[PDB]
Amino acid sequence: DLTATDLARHRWLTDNSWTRPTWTVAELEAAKAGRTISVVLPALNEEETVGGVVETIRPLLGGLVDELIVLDSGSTDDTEIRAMAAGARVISREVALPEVAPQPGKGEVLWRSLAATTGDIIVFIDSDLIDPDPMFVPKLVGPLLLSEGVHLVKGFYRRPLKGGRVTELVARPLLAALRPELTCVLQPLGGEYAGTRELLMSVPFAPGYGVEIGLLVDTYDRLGLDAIAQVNLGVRAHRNRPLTDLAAMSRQVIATLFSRCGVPDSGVGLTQFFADGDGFSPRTSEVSLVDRPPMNTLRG
Amino acid sequence: DLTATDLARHRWLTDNSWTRPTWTVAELEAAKAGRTISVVLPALNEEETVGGVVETIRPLLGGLVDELIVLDSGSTDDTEIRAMAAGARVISREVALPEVAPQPGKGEVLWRSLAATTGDIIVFIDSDLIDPDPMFVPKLVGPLLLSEGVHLVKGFYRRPLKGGRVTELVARPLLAALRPELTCVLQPLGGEYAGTRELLMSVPFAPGYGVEIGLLVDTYDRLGLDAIAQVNLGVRNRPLTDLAAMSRQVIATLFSRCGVPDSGVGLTQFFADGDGFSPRTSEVSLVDRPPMNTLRGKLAAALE
Numbered sequence A: 001d002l003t004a005t006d007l008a009r010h011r012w013l014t015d016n017s018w019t020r021p022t023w024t025v026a027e028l029e030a031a032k033a034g035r036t037i038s039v040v041l042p043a044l045n046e047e048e049t050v051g052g053v054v055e056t057i058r059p060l061l062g063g064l065v066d067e068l069i070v071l072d073s074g075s076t077d078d079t080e081i082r083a084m085a086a087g088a089r090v091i092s093r094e095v096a097l098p099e100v101a102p103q104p105g106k107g108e109v110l111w112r113s114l115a116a117t118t119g120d121i122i123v124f125i126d127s128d129l130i131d132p133d134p135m136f137v138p139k140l141v142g143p144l145l146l147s148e149g150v151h152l153v154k155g156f157y158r159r160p161l162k163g164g165r166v167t168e169l170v171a172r173p174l175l176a177a178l179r180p181e182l183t184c185v186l187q188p189l190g191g192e193y194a195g196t197r198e199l200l201m202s203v204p205f206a207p208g209y210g211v212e213i214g215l216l217v218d219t220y221d222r223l224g225l226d227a228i229a230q231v232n233l234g235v236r237a238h239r240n241r242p243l244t245d246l247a248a249m250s251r252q253v254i255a256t257l258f259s260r261c262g263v264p265d266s267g268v269g270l271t272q273f274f275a276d277g278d279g280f281s282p283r284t285s286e287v288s289l290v291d292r293p294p295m296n297t298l299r300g
Numbered sequence B: 001d002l003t004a005t006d007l008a009r010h011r012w013l014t015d016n017s018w019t020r021p022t023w024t025v026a027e028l029e030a031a032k033a034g035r036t037i038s039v040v041l042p043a044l045n046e047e048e049t050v051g052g053v054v055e056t057i058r059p060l061l062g063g064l065v066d067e068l069i070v071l072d073s074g075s076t077d078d079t080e081i082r083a084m085a086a087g088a089r090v091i092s093r094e095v096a097l098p099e100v101a102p103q104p105g106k107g108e109v110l111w112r113s114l115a116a117t118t119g120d121i122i123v124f125i126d127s128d129l130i131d132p133d134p135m136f137v138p139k140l141v142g143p144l145l146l147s148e149g150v151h152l153v154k155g156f157y158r159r160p161l162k163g164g165r166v167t168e169l170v171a172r173p174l175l176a177a178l179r180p181e182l183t184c185v186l187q188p189l190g191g192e193y194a195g196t197r198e199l200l201m202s203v204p205f206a207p208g209y210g211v212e213i214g215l216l217v218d219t220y221d222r223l224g225l226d227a228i229a230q231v232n233l234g235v236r237n238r239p240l241t242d243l244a245a246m247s248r249q250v251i252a253t254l255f256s257r258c259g260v261p262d263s264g265v266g267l268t269q270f271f272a273d274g275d276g277f278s279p280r281t282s283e284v285s286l287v288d289r290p291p292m293n294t295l296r297g298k299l300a301a302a303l304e
Ligand SMILES: O=Cc1ccc(O)cc1
Pocket: A009, A010, A013, A014, A019, B270, B277
């Protein structure tokens, strides 16, 4: 009947998951107790949405939130200037961490943001969200401010009563196989999450689209379920990404899970083919992004 | 840009992949050279489609095809009667291997069929296909009969000019990580494939929905990429929950073949009523059936 995974997951849901994370901004400010909060929006060519995300967070500046930074990854559209006008601080990868040459991918941006921020709590929110809700940051920081022993909070979106394909086909099944207690986390790949500086400075950062799952597993391997919480951010329909983006995402999720769980990885990516009447000429990507070491090895 | 594995991928697609098989039934019959062909359709509650599949293969019986069997896995609908009416012999799991109690899942059915068939070549075709093409069996056996050194033929379906979600997000990326040459196989999880008796009797069979990936990986390791071919068969909507459970078993079987320590924990959904909570957990098995030549050694030796 019941397994040890079932028992732990059920109890974790009752203690470390909030379906209605309704703490008030005032009570969260009162609980800061000298701690400061930084909010980071990673961004690459998100000109249509970045300002709207910033606008939903900026009312918290000077109270709950101490800094609001857009960490730009080399946009060629109007991402940076729209973020400026909307009321954020825009910092490039190069200014965030001058002593290390950048490499591509989302994980690099989040890692570098640790060097550019000062908060005791760092909140990450994706910059591609349409009409996000102003209560995202309060909900994400609640367990960090109020619940002893929590270092990582994952924000999830409620599923309607009536596409998450990488989460449900790749990430959750692989966690079931390799780290089954972590199947408790509803949206392990979600981009809205918060952590303590103590935690985040102490773990390596996986590259590209592996960053979220890498942080989740590294936290678990150091502190177990007790240190991880999740909060319901409300409704939000699934994003529709191209299938080729998704297969590449899956491949990086696999690589990052394997690196943390002791499984070797070939470094071989997926193959694209030149196709014509003479057949299919393969071109296969190979690994070129490295994990970044804990930021404590360079700062603080 | 080109990388190290691309040479092997290019050679294999040139020699072992057929986008447009030219073969006629007549040429294939003339090439059998004393080999016999068994066709096996695994089935569990497929009354709406099984007859249609059988009807497309039945005209080959007595010529290209020597035996046509539906291996029924305990259906309670009209699968059995509809398969017989279309011209298949229907064999239960118990009849196929009477002294061994059945275990659930698709892999069990295919494994058991090895004890109930006599072919030097065995062709598997899913019984849930809609409007299958009568050239499926000819296309699948072509490389076995007309090429040298091929032991496993995987049928693939035509890709569009732009749901295979498990293949493209799970199987192919995992193979890239753990058996990188095998990403060249377009349909690693496909249910339409043919193998030699020599191969099939000698390998363990993975349980459940792991059977196809397990056979592919075992064939690759033991016989190599050149022993695997693929053929275009020409042109389904399952709930995400079912695809996730299938993915979880594909993972378990690949991990078993690599020695990765899979927990055996399935995918769990909690349900609640007035009395409380209880989990519903998807089926996962890490236990292979042993090579059929260990239980049917005399049959295997007769066929060798
Ligand atoms: O509060 C929601 C909840 C859901 C499933 C559980 O097992 C426990 C709690």
